[PDB]
Design a protein around this ligand. Structure first.
Ligand code: 52L
Ligand code: 52L
Ligand code: BGC
Ligand code: GLC
Lengths: 348, 336, 339, 343
């Protein structure tokens, strides 16, 4: 065709979602994990459970071995702390870049710009399956419009990133997802874009999308009422009581329940991974002092703290982020126990 | 699953491309206008790209009447201006636009809407008038982009990786709007992102998802659309030019006369025009394009009257003729 | 894998249907001719279905000339005959050979099938739009989605009458279907096919979207046998009596279509004129079981080997227009006598 | 679409290939048997291809027990026979009846074709992975894309030997292909089919993505005739000599596979043992043109009728009747001794 594909270099075959769903079906226990976690989060969001949703884990997954070791450790704490916390592992396979960079395990699993996306989808779904089958629910970021069909049935919660909260196609996607969805405030701190997103996601929509067969189609969604805001900072952090109070008022002014999830990382830690523990201290004091609106938190955590560079060509250290820096396991254990103690204090 | 109510059949792009293929004339219109804009962006033509037309298309009849009037000025002023008709089918916000609801009744006859939209784009290009589109999603461009000589990324998606990926593979030049607060950082990031090659998942002309690799698109530029205050003045242009230079990008801008630069007052577009013409006539080479919301009849309507916008308010045809002549005279002055 | 050398993109049927939609006239032509053949097959009409035209289409310009001439005779003889043009785009070869216009439109082994489908559907659309109904052989399992909405009647070839997938195909077609007897002359295989095609089936097929799917059909009751010879011709009234009796035993209407060409003519196109005389005398003598005939006819008689000569078949030899005009008049006269 | 009542979703072949990929053992089994059959067809091996197994598979459990028994004889008789298990899923018929494991795996008219494709591929995978190669029948154009990578040999349905579409299919199959003689016992149509299938073709087909496409094939030279009787059995030395003549006259290798069942056994399953005796006689005497045989065999001889609301006998055909394991063991040993005697 004339005037077509000047800037398209190559087009390669993509496994349809049904191929990944057939190769890696949910086990009974994996399906149980997803169903129970989605119901638990819904109950929190409706105000009928006083526990704290905790979405915690690596900035990005790049190594299934370390991810499964992390998952075993986190599952132990999920079981120990379950009367206070609903613990869901961050299993992020897609990373939004400020400009350019390794986009994650699905886009480039082999970490060498070979872009073996079919391998990436196989690795990602098998890992999500293993984690859910172990009994640990999983959270993801919905950035790509096409990858969710491959994974969403194994997601108990999802986030739409700050750079896409305003995006109509992402709001439409959320309106048809089967899990609860968090919408982050705008990268400059703006709350209104996330409030608008929650309202849009709760409405039914009609739009173009791709089916489990890998074919484009017209899709009609019902709307998703299980959406809430994620506070992730702006030019300055926005986790403190003053900010939470402003957001509660803004939600209620818009007719929405005053409830927030606080991201301890990103702009709320000023991109300094150990400051997540300082955010934790402040948020724990708010919770223990009686703040009911804090229904969830999000934490970037790995086996080993800090981060490392893929671009150097050095062999990668095990269990250590190749993207944002994370707190390590010992801080993670302490942080989770701090949150559990705060939730117990809030209740008693 | 739980929250998917219904899934309906969608014609693949190849069906629309086969039903409404580009005529030799339409193909030539697109090809020459893309090349003309590229030369402007490369600094090898001192003419001004002018993207002008309705806020959104709801009536193909009125749109083709508008196209005929505009083609006359495009040919008349061609030594100073590269005139491209704004052919936007939706207003991001209501009525979901011509593609999503051509019959205006919440029937969501998207297959009909795609047929109507492509036919209109084909007819306008066949007459010799190039068209400019807005790229709001990842699926509709496959049906229409071969008939687009320029496109804008929605302001709500400048920051979105998936829309920067899309731009990196588009065959036409692309404008990225500045941030809602008037800052340009996100737009600079978007131009840098869109300039690089990407690998991502997309839907082919066959209606199947696939892995696509793009080359990167060097024909991307900023659109100034205002922040809390208008940012069309010579002071703001100087600020934007320095920030572009600091980022290693060509110090060039397109200025949107409408929206926050017109302070939400359609007639104020003529005021931005007078100010921008002064800058150009005074020698400002960095202003390479403008965007104007214009229809047959000025104002707007609410879902009736013919040739009058049913979304945002536009200047009517007499102001449009005057505006285009003012810009052409300014370009003449700048040339010397 | 090892014996697949190339896989190339194929336009889906929706693309052809959108580019070349049925005009109002084309749709009316198809609906009327389908209704007319159904009326003839139900015995509620005494006219003769005449499926006549080139062995194969290889030149749309000559086909449109042929169509204009045949349309005039269709209008002239409309009281005795329901005239339907052979528009055959698919050719079953005894071994290897040019498979028709769709498979290789440029007859040079370039296999531009997307071009072939556009050419074929445009031609079929133009012919129906003029008012002339069309007939084809349904050989390919995937091409019928591109063309069947413009077909008023179809044939299953002698070499595929036994084929389960072709019986399934026929069970879901919107047009009447004829089944040729076996190449040895066996009648049973065509009777089995008619019974199978009349029943609902569930099988794998390709949709108008170009995707494979599970398809359920209703069954096609407008099917009938086509007598086309075997070792010896089987058009004589003795053979016709044998077939009507075999049809009765199987509980099927005792009606036949007779193919004047192929083994009935001993592969000699002029002998089609001799078969015509014999069949006309059966009809004029009172034979109501002969509900239709099939004739291989072109602008110029004979055939040629594969520039080409105008109006001559590049596959089986056919009779020319003069013989064609006279044959149709003989048949209409025979119908008028029978009535 | 007046006579199309319903259209239902179908898993594309890639979904089955991803769920049930060929193991290394399975892929090796397929490769080695395809090569061994090629050598036999080209005269570089004096061993006998034996395709043997149930008329149709209705029970994967009995099928795998049969495979385990057959594999043991495959190993024991490997110096004389290339033993390939018949893994057929359907009995083609014009009368009504069970539509086979792929169309109706649950044996109840639910037409759960997606289930049936999963069951059929999983069974083929398991049999190949154990080391036993598998032979299939090609009845349509769409199912082979789900299964053919696990077949070492295939037969085109007797009712489609003359069909251009099935000859096109054969011309692009990765395995050797057998074509059956005509219902009246003549070989003309099968000679035409062998010629047509050995030529390159270009035709429309469904890819592993479940999409129709234009496909070009190389031609299949590993095609041969299957003698299956006509009006009378055609396994006798007089008939083999007559077919050898016709194959030479056509410029094709004078080699044949003899089907011991159906018309050659007068539709009486025990008569397969009489055909075996005669064919062993020809082979032991020095007949080199007999390159393979086809035998309908199961754990338990005879057959049974499928009945709603009722259990079935284990290991016994619900389609045509088969010889049972005792006769199968004796038959395989007879053929092996005849091959030893020929050399
Ligand atoms: O995971 C999250 O919750 C995220 C995504 C976030 O991790 C992003 O992908 C990188 O911070 C970009 O890194 P860069 O700025 O180097 O492109 N929040 O935004
Ligand atoms: O059109 C028909 O009605 C037919 C089909 C017929 O035309 C066939 O395609 C050629 O006779 C094969 O020619 P060859 O024998 O040269 O391959 N009747 O059989
Ligand atoms: O294993 C199932 C059956 O197989 C047959 O070959 C044997 O004769 C039976 O004794 C056995 O029970
Ligand atoms: O970087 C790759 C370059 O070539 C691409 O094909 C584009 O035409 C150009 O804009 C880009 O800068």
């Amino acid at each position: 065709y004339q005037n077509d594909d000047l800037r398209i270099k190559e087009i390669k075959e993509l496994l349809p979602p049904v191929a990944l769903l057939e190769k890696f079906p949910a086990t009974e226990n994996a399906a149980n994990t997803v169903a129970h976690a989605r119901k638990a989060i819904h109950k929190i969001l409706k105000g009928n459970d006083d526990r704290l949703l905790v979405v915690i884990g690596p900035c990005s997954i790049h190594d299934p071995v370390a991810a499964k070791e992390y998952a075993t450790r986190l599952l132990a704490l999920r079981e120990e702390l379950k009367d206070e916390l609903e613990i869901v592992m961050r299993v992020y396979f897609e990373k939004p870049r400020t400009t350019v960079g390794w986009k994650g395990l699905i886009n480039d699993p082999h970490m060498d710009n070979s872009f073996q996306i079919n391998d990436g989808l196989r690795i990602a779904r098998k890992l999500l399956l293993d984690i859910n089958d172990s009994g640990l629910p999983a959270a993801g970021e919905f950035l790509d419009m096409i990858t969710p069909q491959y994974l969403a049935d194994l997601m108990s919660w999802g986030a739409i990133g700050a750079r896409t909260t305003e995006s109509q196609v992402h709001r439409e996607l959320a309106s048809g997802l089967s899990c609860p969805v968090g919408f982050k405030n705008g990268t400059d701190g703006t709350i209104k874009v996330a409030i608008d997103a929650i309202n849009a996601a709760g409405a039914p929509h009609c739009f173009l999308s791709v089916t489990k067969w890998g074919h484009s189609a017209i899709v009609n969604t019902s709307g998703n009422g299980d959406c809430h805001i994620i506070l992730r900072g702006g030019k300055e952090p926005n986790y403190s009581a003053k900010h939470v109070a402003e957001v509660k008022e803004g939600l209620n002014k818009a007719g929405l329940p005053a409830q927030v999830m606080i991201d301890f990382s990103h702009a709320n830690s000023s991109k300094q991974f150990k400051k997540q523990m300082d955010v934790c201290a402040d948020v724990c004091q708010q919770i223990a002092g009686g703040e009911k609106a804090i229904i969830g938190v999000m934490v970037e955590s790995h086996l080993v703290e800090g981060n490392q560079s893929l671009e150097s060509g050095e062999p990668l250290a095990y269990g250590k982020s190749i993207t944002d820096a994370c707190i390590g396991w010992e801080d993670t254990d302490a942080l989770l126990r701090q949150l559990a103690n705060a939730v117990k204090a809030r209740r008693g």
